[PDB]
Amino acid sequence: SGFRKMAFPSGKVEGCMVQVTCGTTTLNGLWLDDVVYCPRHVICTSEDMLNPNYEDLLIRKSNHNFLVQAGNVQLRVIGHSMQNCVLKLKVDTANPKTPKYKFVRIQPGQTFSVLACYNGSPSGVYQCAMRPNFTIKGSFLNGSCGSVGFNIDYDCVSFCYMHHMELPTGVHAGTDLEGNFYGPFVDRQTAQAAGTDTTITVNVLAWLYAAVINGDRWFLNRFTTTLNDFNLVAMKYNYEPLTQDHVDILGPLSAQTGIAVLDMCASLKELLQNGMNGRTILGSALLEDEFTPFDVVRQCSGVT
Amino acid sequence: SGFRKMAFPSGKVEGCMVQVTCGTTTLNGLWLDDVVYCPRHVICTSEDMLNPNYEDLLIRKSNHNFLVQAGNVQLRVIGHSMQNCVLKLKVDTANPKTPKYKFVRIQPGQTFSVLACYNGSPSGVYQCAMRPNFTIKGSFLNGSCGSVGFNIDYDCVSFCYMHHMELPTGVHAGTDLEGNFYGPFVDRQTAQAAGTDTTITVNVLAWLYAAVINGDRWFLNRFTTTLNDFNLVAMKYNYEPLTQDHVDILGPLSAQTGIAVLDMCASLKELLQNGMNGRTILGSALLEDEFTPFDVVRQCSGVT
């Protein structure tokens, strides 16, 4: 029993963290095989960020200008290229610690572990969700750029996120490992506002099932609802509309608890309309939306 | 910016996780140097747990009865002994992945990362606090026993906790790495109730400073208080009494924000007496007490 915002073990990702320096800028790099991936804004100075011409800026850089250090040993750069907002620095040594890996572009509402790093060294690990507005609510400071988000399937690390920037609104934006930003964000020091963030309804429902599994059942009521009626209440509270796919994805949790998805929706409807009335669910006084139905099943079954 | 319940990178601890089997019982072991540490209840069967005589039970066991497997390779057991509620299985091979380590018995109110494991394999990592009543609110299932709690100081892992049991109340009890339980708990299937849990006041104050550092200042008021007056309000809300040592420990956070400790206490006093009025602090609708002043400084400065 017990339910926590649990991150994946970070060991396989720590063995990939390197330090990338270009001129006076230092950030984190991800070393896999003979390639180091890092945000392309490493080539910029603070003066360049207002409207950088990355193609022009990169042209004034050669392999020798990119200092790559793994722990305390220097890597020799034999190639360099820009793929969207990431630089791929080809090194002459394959990372002996490269795990089995994939590059995946995650869907909004999905979750992942972040290995926050500074100067190629890991500082901490936490669970995040890609918000419906494609921002992440992480914990990042200057030098954290290049830190990565990932998931693990037994021995395979799926890299989904690379951290690039913090917006003036305090939220975090970044790319997949091919350099494509999640959302409308650009790697430029300009006014950028994220869209309206919604609550991930399927995740809140998944977390209600985790609460039921872990003994917190006070919010269970004698009511039911339909997808259409629930969605009217979801729209008013800026929750993501619930689809039949979401109901299907909640199937394993519904079978484990014996509580129908639409009955759980009715408990959620009453929680939205009436609040928590001072009570808590899984030690929280608000509806948690950063646990997918897969995260709930995983944590409640002990998948290693 | 951003504030998360951040765990330490678990890499150094994953390299120590082994599987210990004794008869029909399988749990996790911690392999450091040529010694594997695991909860002594590994020698019990479900029939023995009502009132086990561990000395008698251990006497019917020999080195060959303890199956220790690290990944997929079998370790040879050349010695075995009971130190309080832990068994120390001496193996003929030193763990090549042993990090620099210490065994520390933590103080209540202090925090640590848990590497939850099943069958010697890590499933996840999360931040915990040793509650004032010496229980932990973790996430553990059957087979999670032997999972460890720890902290890291650059290259040194300080092992503070080994998971042993879940109480009927759904809370978690365990030992330090010398086998001494935190709290009054015994490794026996009997009725055991934890004491009254209090809120770690110095941690809630530390988290209020993190909220101020990260932009959430709505709760800051035009008031102040004294240690004696604040403590009258802390007693009523079952918060730990605030001492001058706690004020001193909050000094670095007070200097960074420019907000005196007693002024922050006054904001907390008003939050206790009036609630959050529907608002949130750092994405939470309740007062968070599982971040020490050291955790706040670390996260807000980027210590790797």
Ligand SMILES: COc1cc(Cl)cc(CC(=O)Nc2cnccc2C)c1
């Ligand atoms: C000045 O314009 C910038 C533009 C880009 Cl694309 C990147 C940066 C660096 C940056 O945002 N670092 C950072 C990331 N997360 C938390 C905090 C910080 C300070 C700056």
Ligand SMILES: COc1cc(Cl)cc(CC(=O)Nc2cnccc2C)c1
């Ligand atoms: C039956 O008496 C017991 C006594 C002790 Cl000392 C230990 C156990 C095993 C246990 O508690 N495992 C566990 C730990 N955390 C979460 C869930 C579980 C099921 C059982």
